[PDB]
Write a protein that binds this ligand. Structure first.
Ligand SMILES: N[C@H]1CC[C@H](Nc2nc(NCc3ccccc3)c3ncn(C4CCCC4)c3n2)CC1
Length: 275
């Protein structure tokens, strides 16, 4: 520290606060995450994880107890953007450009066996150029984007949890209302089951053996995708249902998703934003 002037608190992060600040010497505006040995380690791989779709971890000043993370500074997050576009909605070409880049980022860190684990509109940042970046990785909290295997007690979940979370984000950008706005784990799970149908050994081998599966869960039918994501076209739905498959193994990878016919016509338009 001491070389940074906390300009303004801009949020509450995963394990610490986040401030907008000037590098008292450089003059450049940056983003700080203040937080509360194995750690420093997982952070090392983070500095050498450069991709146009991942926020840039600039420095890591570890000065006695308090540990700071210095990131490049981004213009705005996706929740705010969505909030600001609620009356008209986000134009498809843009919704499409963003999904494409995000999948590019995911494909990248999945290659390096790094998962995000907590993907959401608030952990996605954008700039005036039309780029979107994945932010705040992992190791009154929200559960709407939780994959079903995590809610069922799987302790060794894969990179597929991210595809699921992205799947939920995709739908929300198209319909403008969260897909599964649960308020408790069991509530979350039931909203999922009431839409995609209650999973059984047929669609999810091993599901009934999961730590938190109860033979007593109600048995709901699976709802038509025409009703769930109405304005989305058929290519969009193919993809959405493949990102939302119960079985983590049959759930589509980031790599494959990038080749889905839904992206044939993907362009890179710029957003109109109020900073
Ligand atoms: N869980 C989340 C908690 C809040 C955190 N927010 C947040 N907001 C940013 N910009 C938004 C902005 C713009 C203008 C005024 C006010 C705010 C930002 N830029 C880099 N970071 C990093 C620091 C962390 C990495 C990204 C940011 N984190 C993001 C993570």
């Amino acid at each position: 520290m001491e070389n940074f002037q906390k300009v303004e608190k801009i949020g509450e992060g995963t394990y610490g606060v986040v401030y907008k600040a000037r590098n008292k010497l450089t003059g450049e505006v940056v983003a700080l995450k203040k937080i509360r040995s194995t750690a420093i380690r997982e952070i090392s791989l983070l500095k050498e994880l450069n991709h146009p779709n991942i926020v840039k971890l600039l420095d890591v000043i570890h000065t006695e107890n308090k540990l700071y993370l210095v990131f490049e500074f981004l213009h705005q997050d996706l929740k705010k953007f969505m909030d600001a576009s609620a009356l008209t909605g986000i134009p498809l070409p843009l919704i499409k450009s963003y999904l494409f880049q995000l999948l590019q980022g995911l494909a990248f860190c999945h290659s390096h066996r790094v998962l995000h684990r907590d993907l959401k509109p608030q952990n996605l940042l954008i700039n005036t150029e039309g780029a979107i970046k994945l932010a705040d990785f992992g190791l009154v909290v929200t559960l709407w984007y939780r994959a079903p295997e995590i809610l069922l007690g799987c302790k060794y979940y894969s990179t597929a949890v991210d595809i699921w979370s992205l799947g939920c984000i995709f739908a929300e950008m198209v319909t403008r209302r969260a897909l599964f706005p649960g308020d408790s784990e069991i509530d979350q799970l039931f909203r999922i089951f009431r839409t995609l149908g209650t999973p059984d050994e047929v669609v999810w081998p091993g599901v009934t053996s999961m730590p938190d599966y109860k033979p007593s869960f109600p048995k709901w039918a699976r709802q038509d995708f025409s009703k769930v994501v109405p304005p989305l076209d058929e290519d969009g739905r193919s993809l959405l249902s493949q990102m939302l498959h119960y079985d983590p193994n049959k759930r589509i990878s980031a790599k494959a998703a990038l080749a889905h016919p839904f992206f044939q016509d993907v362009t890179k338009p710029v957003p109109h934003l109020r900073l």
